[PDB]
Structure 1
Amino acid sequence: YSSTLMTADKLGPGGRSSVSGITATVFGANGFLGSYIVNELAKRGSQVVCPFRSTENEAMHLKQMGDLGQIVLLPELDIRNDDDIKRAISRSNVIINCVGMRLQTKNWSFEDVHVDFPKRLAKLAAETGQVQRLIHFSDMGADENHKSLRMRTKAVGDKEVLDAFPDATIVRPGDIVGIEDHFYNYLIYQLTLTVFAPVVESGSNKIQPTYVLDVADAVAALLRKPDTAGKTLYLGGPEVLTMREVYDLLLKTLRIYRDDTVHLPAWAVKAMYKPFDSVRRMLPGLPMTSPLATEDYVEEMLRDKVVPAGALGYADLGIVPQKVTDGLAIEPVRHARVGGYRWGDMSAVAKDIPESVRKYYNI
């Protein structure tokens, strides 16, 4: 149980054909973070079971991630049915929950996804007896006294999970950056493609964004260390930034020479977002609706979302988190700049380059 999870059945040096001994069930495996977690587990020789609700075309990318027989795909998942949850975890000694929601729909509310399903999942996990680890994902700004509904339902579900499954680990990362993220992508869709970009108040609320590969490494580091069972970890990058600094960094990176943002009082932003929030129910959910066009985002922007003092973070897992503002994490937003990424004139350094290279590049 302690460190018998990672040692007792480990066969091979740890590549694609090796065996790690982990059978894991990842809920929400076709999502943004879940795909990276499923890739992290399967590449080391673990069997990963992936139930999903969507069409098979949106889950086909998970089939590549592991050797023959080690990626198991279970379509038509209904999380209101306990039989599907029971079948999906029936051979697993690790359960990882990445199921979450950002907007409400006439079929699904925040309590159904953040409260009721994690409680029933923790109960059915404790019923089996062979599940040695339950990794539940919540947010850094989760709080029971939060005006935003999703943060409050997330904290309530964290309490229910720690109640029903006492050794379950609660993971609370900050904003996650990546190619398919929900943080820079919507901010770039707000800087471009709109007449103006509203900023709540002065934009001085602080955040701690983190990289998706560091969170994927954090899950494996949690599975290694037995002490982290039953704890709560906050995952945040090495830099604390305000939203105005994030907007300035995106405007400098995109090479946009016209600041289209406008600072607005919070009541004005809520008055803008109110007509498309009283009609969010009785509707099956519309494409290209931003998760920033809600009052819950406005309430989140009136507070800090950072790692608390004395909390367990990346350093207790042995991980030095990568920088988010520069390097490989900022390379996808550099592709959306005006004109294209491109190299340059490339002629100052081609002086003492050999003969065929300059003609090959037509310099």
Structure 2
Amino acid sequence: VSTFPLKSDINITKSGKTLLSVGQGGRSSRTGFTATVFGGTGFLGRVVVSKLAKHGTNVVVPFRNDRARRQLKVNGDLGVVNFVEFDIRNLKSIEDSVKYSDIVINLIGTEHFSKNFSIEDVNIGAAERIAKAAKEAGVSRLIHVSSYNANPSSSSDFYATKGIGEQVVRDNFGPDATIVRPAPMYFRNSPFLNELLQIKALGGNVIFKKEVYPVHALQVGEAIERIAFDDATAGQTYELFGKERYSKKELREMIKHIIHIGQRGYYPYSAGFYLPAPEPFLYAFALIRQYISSQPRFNVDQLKRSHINQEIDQSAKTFTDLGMVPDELSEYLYRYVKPHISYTSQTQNRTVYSKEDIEKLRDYVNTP
């Protein structure tokens, strides 16, 4: 964020346009850039739209949910945030979103498949169509967000389609496409933290054994702001991850002590905080809810991913190439699990967990 995001007030795009910024960098200021944020109504999308629009950059937000786009307009001044009703199966709608854009950020991706879209259609088909449409519109910069374990030869549908998505985007848009591989992101209402905060987490012995390198979502959106406005980042791949490795079981137990579920010894077991189930049963339950439940549940592919840990591609670039220091989960863990605390309510004394308190709590969890 800061007070002025650009490193200079004059920027020349890859397509030759000269863009001049006006103002000190506030709501009424402008940067001269127009950006399209595909999937701007999602979790990461709202962070990206907020950062771009708060400094005056024009943001075009294609959308399919009419109620979800309303809160995005508050980020920018009048005329800054624009909306286009779009569908990845409508070519004309996508071409209208990128017609006036200098930067296109593709945040569209899914871990589930539904009655209308498969994993291939969103992770590969949508990315290819957006990338090819951006090039025909003469967009200077394209930013695609893949997954952390993107590998075209992976046995998981999510990781494989993300790996193919990286290659199909570079073929269509060209060598000037920047690819971002973010780790699981922690933030308010973060999907990575929502699963850990769920009291009745079925099959926690099979799912919560995955080890990851969680990264702050605010930094991921900040990194995208750096990448979009820096042409030196074109054609590169960025792996965004934290320094400290964590297992979901450690996070699950650390959260359990922060929420003070253990104030009553019987309660965590009675309330269902532990639901040990065989993996074949979890596979059957995940398979059934893939065709009965109308809401995306824990599906078959996510069961496979519980056995796959996050491996970091060493050749790719990191926060150091962008001049940033990754945030530590221990610093921000308390403020993002604070809403789920049982009672608190300043009864006697709030137990504020600092950076050192969280690290000590990690030792207690692993202490038998």
After TM superposition, the structure 1 = structure 2 runs for residues 54-133 of structure 1, keeping only pairs within 5 Å, are 54-55=65-66, 57-75=67-85, 77-129=86-138, 131-133=139-141
Distance 1:227 1:265 in 2: 50
Q: Contact 1:253–1:337 (CA<8 Å) still a contact in 2?
A: yes
Secondary structure in structure 2 of the residue aligned to 1:317: coil
In the alignment, is residue 161 of structure 1 matched against residue 169 of structure 2?
yes
1:218 alignment partner, SS class: helix
Query: Partners in 2 of 1:3 and 1:171 — Cα distance?
Result: 23
Aligned-pair CA distance for 1:270: 2.1
Alignment counterpart, residue 46 of structure 1, candidates 57, 71, 79: 57
Cα 1:214/1:54, change in 2 over 3 Å? same
- Quote the Cα distance in structure 1 between the aligned partners of 2:170 and 2:240: 19
Aligned residues: 329
Q: Does 2:343 match 1:339?
A: yes
Deviation at 1:205, TM superposition (A): 3.5
Contact kept? 1:3, 1:225, Cα under 8 Å? no
1:256, distance to aligned residue in structure 2 (A): 2.0
Separation in structure 1 between the aligned mates of residue 115 and residue 218 of structure 2, nearest angstrom: 34
Superposed CA offset, 1:136-158 (max 9, x none)? 11110222122221221111111
Which amino acid in the other structure matches residue 88 of structure 2? I
Q: Tell me what 1:325 maps to.
A: 330
Q: TM-score under structure 2 normalisation?
A: 0.83
Equivalent of residue 180 in structure 1, options 181, 189, 193: 189
> Quick one: distance in 2 between partners of 1:127 and 1:10?
26
From 185, 198, 204, the equivalent of 1:198 is 204
What is the distance in 1 between the residues matched to 2:51 and 2:155?
A: 35
Query: By percentage of residues, which structure has more helix?
Result: 2
Task: Identify the structure with bigger relative contact order (alpha carbons < 8 Å, sequence gap 6+).
Answer: 1
**In the alignment, residue 68 of structure 1 is paired with which amino acid?**
L
Shift of 1:120: 1.4
Q: More deviation in 261-270 or 315-324?
A: 261-270
Structure-2 residue corresponding to 1:275: 288
1:19 aligned to which of 30, 34, 58 = 30
Secondary structure of the corresponding residue to residue 83 of structure 2 = strand
Distance in 2 (CA, whole Å) between partners of 1:326 and 1:12 is: 34
Tell me how far 1:302 sits from its aligned partner: 1.0
Matched, 1:135 2:140: no
Alpha-carbon distance change, 209 to 113 in structure 1, aligned in 2, over 3 angstroms: same
SS of 1:325's equivalent? helix
Q: Which has the larger radius of gyration?
A: 1
Contact 1:45 1:66 in 2 (8 A): yes
CA distance in structure 2 between the partners assigned to 1:253 and 1:193 by the alignment:
17
Shift of 1:70: 1.0
> Displacement, 1:274?
2.7
Please report how far the alpha carbon of residue 340 of structure 1 lies from its aligned counterpart in structure 2 after TM superposition. Answer: 3.2
Q: How big is each residue's C-alpha offset from its partner over 1:141-176, in whole Å with a ceiling of 9 and x where there is no partner?
A: 222122221221111111100111121111110111
One-letter code aligned to 2:322: L
Cα separation, 1, equivalents of 2:68 and 2:167: 32
Helix, strand or coil at the partner of 1:275 = helix
Give the match for residue 7 of structure 2.
none
| Contact 2:145-2:180 at 8 Å conserved across structures | yes
CA contact 2:319–2:325 (8 Å) conserved in 1: yes
TM-score by length of 1: 0.84
1:172–1:234 CA contact under 8 A, matched in 2? yes
Instruction: Give the letter aligned to residue 339 of structure 1.
Output: Y
Following superposition, the deviation at residue 244 of structure 1 comes to 1.7
Instruction: Write the letter of the residue equivalent to 2:223.
Output: A
Write the deviation string for residues 227-272 of structure 1: whole angstroms up to 9, x where unpaired. 2211111111121111221212221222222363356664443244
Distance change (3 Å), C-alpha of 1:100 and 1:342: farther
